[PDB]
Amino acid sequence: MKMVVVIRNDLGMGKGKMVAQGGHAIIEAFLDAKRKNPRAVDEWLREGQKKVVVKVNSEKELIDIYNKARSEGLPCSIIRDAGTLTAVAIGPEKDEKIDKITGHLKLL
Amino acid sequence: MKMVVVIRNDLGMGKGKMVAQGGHAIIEAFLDAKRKNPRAVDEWLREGQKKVVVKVNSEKELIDIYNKARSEGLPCSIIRDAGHTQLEPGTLTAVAIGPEKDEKIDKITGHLKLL
Numbered sequence: 001m002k003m004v005v006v007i008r009n010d011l012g013m014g015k016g017k018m019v020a021q022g023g024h025a026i027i028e029a030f031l032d033a034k035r036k037n038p039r040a041v042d043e044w045l046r047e048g049q050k051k052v053v054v055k056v057n058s059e060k061e062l063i064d065i066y067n068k069a070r071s072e073g074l075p076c077s078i079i080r081d082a083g084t085l086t087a088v089a090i091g092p093e094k095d096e097k098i099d100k101i102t103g104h105l106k107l108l
Numbered sequence: 109m110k111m112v113v114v115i116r117n118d119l120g121m122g123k124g125k126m127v128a129q130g131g132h133a134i135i136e137a138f139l140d141a142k143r144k145n146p147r148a149v150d151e152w153l154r155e156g157q158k159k160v161v162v163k164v165n166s167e168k169e170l171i172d173i174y175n176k177a178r179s180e181g182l183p184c185s186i187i188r189d190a191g192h193t194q195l196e197p198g199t200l201t202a203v204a205i206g207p208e209k210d211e212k213i214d215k216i217t218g219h220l221k222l223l
Binding site: 005007014015016017018019020022023024026027030031045049051052053054082107108 | 113115122123124125126127128130131132134135138153156157159160161162163222223
């Protein structure tokens with residue numbers, strides 16, 4: 001199992017901000033998943049809570065990835081900074097259900 | 109309420125690595141805070157789960173920050189990243205302290221520079 005964190009690379013966010021924004025994404029996706037399948041989330045935690053960080057190059061692309069996750073019915077989240085949408089996170093979920101969504105994205 | 113994420117800046121970690129390692133720290137401190145003070149976590153979440161990311165430049169300082177947080181009774185975590193190459197040991201990459209009252213957390217990490 002794994003969680004994929006999607007960070008926008010076109011916003012010019014600094015290292016600290018990407019960690020914080022991805023950070024909000026991670027917490028929200030985790031909670032979204034835990035509220036739906038706590039048992040799967042427990043497994044993800046036992047195996048090392050694997051996370052993979054990928055990037056998208058526009059807000060439209062960030063939103064597309066998120067909509068796709070929601071349509072597939074996967075745990076996910078989309079973050080808005082204090083204004084724009086900065087990041088998304090999908091999972092934890094079985095690796096193949098997530099790769100379906102973000103498999104083509106490049107690593108941050 | 110706020111959570112401070114401490115990232116090592118002397119390990120040559122790339123942007124993605126930092127988000128991931130910080131991510132493991134954030135999750136771990138969160139779980140620790142949930143068992144040590146559920147109510148405070150809810151408030152943090154309601155208020156937009158503010159997170160501030162600072163940096164340290166050695167394992168020593170990372171550990172000291174973690175110890176200081178434990179010695180203060182604050183929820184926290186310290187992460188170990190499995191070995192780069194089978195020819196090198198894993199490393200302590202990040203620490204997360206909180207969530208908890210801003211005052212308390214600043215008492216411990218206030219002097220750290222933003223990442």
